[PDB]
């Protein structure tokens, strides 16, 4: 039973790719998570819902496990405050934008993007 199954998992190699590749034709939303965090578990279904309703939208929805060895990497470069953090990567953006990670904000995020 894997954690947050609807979201594809970036590796450290993968997300350092995401941040260095540009001409990204598509925006990304990336959840910085850690599978022992209670709020991560309670938000898990909120993120799974986000991913389903955004599937086929052109927005890639992914997750990156940011505890342990990655924790300081995520703290310096990935704007990881505390778990979970939501990073939004626009097509043409100076930097990923940290986005509030509470339930109604996620519902706000989904429904907004659906009207493009």
Residue numbers in the entry: -3 to 112
Published text:
In plants, the C-terminal domain of APR itself serves the function like thioredoxin. To gain more insights into the C-terminal redox domain of plant-type APR, here we present a comprehensive structural and biochemical study of Arabidopsis thaliana APR1 (AtAPR1).
To provide insights into the structural basis of the AtAPR1 redox domain, we produced and crystallized the C-terminal redox domain of Arabidopsis APR1 (residues 353–461) and obtained crystal belonging to the tetragonal space group with the following unit-cell dimensions: a = b = 58.2, c = 86.7 Å. Finally, the crystal structure of the AtAPR1 redox domain was refined to Rwork = 17.9% and Rfree = 25.0% with high-quality backbone geometry checked by Ramachandran plot. The redox-active motif (Cys33-Pro34-Phe35-Cys36) is located at the N-terminal end of the α2-helix, consisting of residues Pro34 to Leu50. The packing of the sandwich-like architecture is mainly maintained by hydrophobic interactions between the sheet and helices. Surface potential distribution of the redox domain shows most positive-charged residues around the redox-active motif. Notably, the surface charge distribution around the GSH binding site of the AtAPR1 redox domain is ideally complementary to the charge of GSH, but other thioredoxins are not.
